[PDB]
Design a protein around this nucleic acid. Sequence first.
DNA 1: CGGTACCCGGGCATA
DNA 2: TTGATTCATAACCTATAGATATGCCCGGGTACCG
RNA 3: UCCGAGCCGGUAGUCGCGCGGUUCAAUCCCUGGUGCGGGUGCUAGUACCGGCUCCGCACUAUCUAUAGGUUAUGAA
Length: 600
Amino acid sequence: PTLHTCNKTSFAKAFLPNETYRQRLLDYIAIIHQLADHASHALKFYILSTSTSSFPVVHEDTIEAILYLLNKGEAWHPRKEAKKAWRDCLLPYVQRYCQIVGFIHPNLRGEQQSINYLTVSMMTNLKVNVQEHFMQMLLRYINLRFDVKGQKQRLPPKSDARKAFFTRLRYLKSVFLFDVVPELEFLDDLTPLESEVLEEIWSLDLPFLPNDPLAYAIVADPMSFFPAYCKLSGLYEQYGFQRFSAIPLRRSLIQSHVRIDTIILYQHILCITRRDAETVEKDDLWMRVCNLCTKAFRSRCGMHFEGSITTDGASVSVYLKHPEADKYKALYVENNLPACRAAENVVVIDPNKRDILYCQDSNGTTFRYTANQRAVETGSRRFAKRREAMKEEAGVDLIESRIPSHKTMNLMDFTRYLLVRRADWDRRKEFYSHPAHTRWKWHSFINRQKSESDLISNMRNKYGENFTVVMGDWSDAGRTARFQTSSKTKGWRTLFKRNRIDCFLLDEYKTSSVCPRCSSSEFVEKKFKTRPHSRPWRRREGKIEKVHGLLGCTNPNCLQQAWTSGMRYWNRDMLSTCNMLLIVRSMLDGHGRPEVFSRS
DNA sequence: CGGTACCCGGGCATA
DNA sequence: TTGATTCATAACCTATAGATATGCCCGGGTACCG
RNA sequence: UCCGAGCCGGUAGUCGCGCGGUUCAAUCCCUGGUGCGGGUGCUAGUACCGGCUCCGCACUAUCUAUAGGUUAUGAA
Ligand SMILES: [Mg+2]
Ligand SMILES: [Mg+2]
Ligand SMILES: [Zn+2]
């Protein structure tokens, strides 16, 4: 449920023109960012130093104690046995790490809220990493050990001999996940590679469940897998394969948004005593520093401000909190045909790397939202160029290029990395302290919002005030094919949902191999013509590319006697849009998806 | 000079 | 869908988790008394 | 290491066509849009009325930190 929402507005328009409050909040957020960064680094340092014997169990108390020790040192006096024990255990190396990195103790006062937020965020990052990239990383390690790439490149494809190996590995996956109990003969029959992989997997001491797979165990108790993940990272480093970040480190020196609440407000911004704060209403207390009459603070869908924002000094995130807060396959068009039937107009979109949205309707009014247009309107390319120019002028790129890997588990290498970072820490901090980096983020947000609004307005003008959007199911989410730029595929669903425009998915399978004029796939031609590579550096290198967005039909019926080409040329995006139109018409007419596009 | 008791602000804990 | 190994700093995207307030005490100062 | 969109043709619903011609749109500064009125500012010939610009009435628009893949750059 949408219990929370945010209206991101500018810093100038969010707060009243009082320099004292602005300076106080800027200083506070800077201090909290420094504390979070150094706390993540100290946690990594402690884990690597104590890894000589065993991996310590990391809990909320551990990170909280690390943060408190960094801020105050031994002056922190926890009143609970667990926190006291954590402080006693973690104290010895905190000062050593601070001296190594020259970390001067800030001894910030009234850090309760900020330390709690940072500890919660760090534990969240740990849990998210463990959940997301444990199973995936383990399977990646298994495949790397099996050398699946080598077998694929060397062994014949689509053959029973290698289908046998594929089935063998698929069945062994269940044994690795403990879903299927292996027999003694099954274990004996394992080849040396399979036996070694099974033994190494068991060395991680992975948890187990009686009636559920390993993924269910990860979902239920993800935190228990942290030692296994660390050992897997160590194995990755030992074997020489590319390393991965097991412990999340907040290495970015750019100013980061810091939560600011009413307590922080009256402790640092207003600097009034807790006694006086309780005597004033929250809205009245906030009006002294924020213009609540501003549009950004208006209530939407029953949600109110309730005094909670995160600011980075340039853009202010104003969060609207619903009164009911916690107090601290169905999207496909096949299942949404009635909505399309009652829609005033139906528009089908075929996502692509370049043509992010290629739109068409029954009336034939074509519309597209290309990647180049998005780059121009958002300004990502211009901002990247300016950032590169600034880095070259300041020489920051040279400094950063020599920073060792943060993902290494080696203690001495990590110490050298920390020393290198400290060598030019001041220069990079000063460079990234420039307002452009935050102002760049704020301007990127504004440009993206304006581009989305313009896209919606153009679509409404072309197709009408009310219309329904049908989009292909293809989505390069998470993964991204190498040598290809990132593209927005799944965010358009959210964008259309925000603008109260229906967004229904559709299967793109074999939607670029059918000619609409004859509804046949035999005569469709692909990659028939060659031309120099469109990418300038490849073109200079002399490479040649095959056209993918151009398709033609060899069917004589589609041709005309006067033509000399011998084929009816087509646009890949246009073909996909026409095929989607035909599929949607068939579905709405009740005939279902055409048999030509149907799967095997 | 020496000792007792109350209030305020902040530190620390927990839902 | 569309192109043909290791590291760091940005970005784009995608996914995950979290998105504040009240109470106890303690010690340091002050008022009061002997 | 580069790139806006629309229209007219070579095209016949064709190409990262570094194919030709033509129209307006953005490069700084800016949270965005939607319906109402006013104030008068600019846009058109005598209330006809569309458009751009501000004012304020109310409906709507979730961000943050981290990891992964990729891109740009700097190193290998
Ligand atoms: Mg598609
Ligand atoms: Mg396509
Ligand atoms: Zn055909």
